[PDB]
Structure 1
Amino acid sequence: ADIQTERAYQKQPTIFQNKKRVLLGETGKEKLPRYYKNIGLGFKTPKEAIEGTYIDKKCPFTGNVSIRGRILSGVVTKMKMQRTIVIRRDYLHYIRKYNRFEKRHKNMSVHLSPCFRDVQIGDIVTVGECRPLSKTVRFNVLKVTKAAGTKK
């Protein structure tokens, strides 16, 4: 129930939920000893990663996935894929002949960790490049801001 939704058991690897034979009830207070890491580059591993009970292998905090190479920013426009979003990076491409620019938008598919609750669309998001973890997806969400306009 709750976490174990799929047909297989869904555990974090790299922690052994078993060793126990002492008083004061079955298991501890926190019960499951949650593994997480920090991702570096001065990115704060969030509360809901460390505190939260979910699991996801592709989550950069609580999963096997290393951030490296490029770090880009975009803005979230679709949230209908599960544990993933489409973010629309915009940019001004220069033509030289006409000393002018043209708008151009690449909309990248991007893995969104469930440590991030309360992510709306139109949300300025930062994504780290990672190893390719889907056909299209290479980029994990690292931090979210949302503050451009509508409310805290």
Structure 2
Amino acid sequence: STELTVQSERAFQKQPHIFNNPKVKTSKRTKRWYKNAGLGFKTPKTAIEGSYIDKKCPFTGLVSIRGKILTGTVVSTKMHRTIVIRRAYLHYIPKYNRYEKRHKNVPVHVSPAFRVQVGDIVTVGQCRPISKTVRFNVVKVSAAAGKANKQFAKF
């Protein structure tokens, strides 16, 4: 997200307290702030060499990942910088001594470091309430192949 409309907004989108001194020409021309969220969750390079803002990003923004870390499959990417993921599980009734498929849907903030899509298993980490519903931010995207290189039109 180095390019392609960082500023499309009524307010000026910038990181808080990151002063770009205009006199001193240091050969980066925009200081960028990042952190690691902890717990082995790497800071992706497209956050470092990308130039999105995302005040709710776990790396470049002002949210701290702490609490539960969950995993789930992305089902819906039709908001802006937010997804809902499906947490499928089995629930056990003791009378039948058997299990039932339940699920809960969890809306998760996606940083614009990642390029998620539906059907992607993804690692999400708890934060403060981002929205009315969102409490989790994507800390790691666990899609590897997706079986999509063997399906298109052939000679």
The two structures have a TM-score, normalised by structure 2, of 0.89
Q: How many residue pairs end up in the alignment?
A: 146
Shift in Å at residue 148 of structure 1? 6.1
Shift in Å at residue 50 of structure 1? 0.8
Which residue identity is paired with 1:120?
Answer: Q
Distance in 2 between residues matched to 1:148 and 1:135, nearest whole Å = 34
Answering whether residue 80 of structure 2 is matched by residue 77 of structure 1, we say no
Gaps of 5+ in 1: 22-26
Distance in 2 between residues matched to 1:34 and 1:74, nearest whole Å = 30
Gaps of 5+ in 2: 150-155
Answering whether residue 67 of structure 2 is matched by residue 64 of structure 1, we say no
Q: Please, what is the CA RMSD of the aligned residues?
A: 1.6
> Residues 83-120 of structure 1, C-alpha deviation per residue, up to 9 Å, x if partnerless?
00010000000000001000011011000000002x22
Answering whether residue 119 of structure 2 is matched by residue 125 of structure 1, we say no
Of 98, 123, 140 in structure 2, the residue corresponding to residue 143 of structure 1 is 140
Shift in Å at residue 29 of structure 1? 3.3
Question: Identity of paired residues, percent?
Answer: 70
Shift in Å at residue 19 of structure 1? 4.4
Moved over 4 A (4+): none
1:150 aligned counterpart, secondary structure: coil
Give the aligned partner of residue 9 of structure 1: 12
Shift in Å at residue 13 of structure 1? 0.9
Contact 1:129 / 1:140 at 8 angstroms: preserved in 2?
yes
Distance in 1 between residues matched to 2:144 and 2:105, nearest whole Å = 21
Answering whether residue 109 of structure 2 is matched by residue 106 of structure 1, we say no
Contact 1:108 / 1:137 at 8 angstroms: preserved in 2?
yes
1:16 aligned counterpart, secondary structure: coil
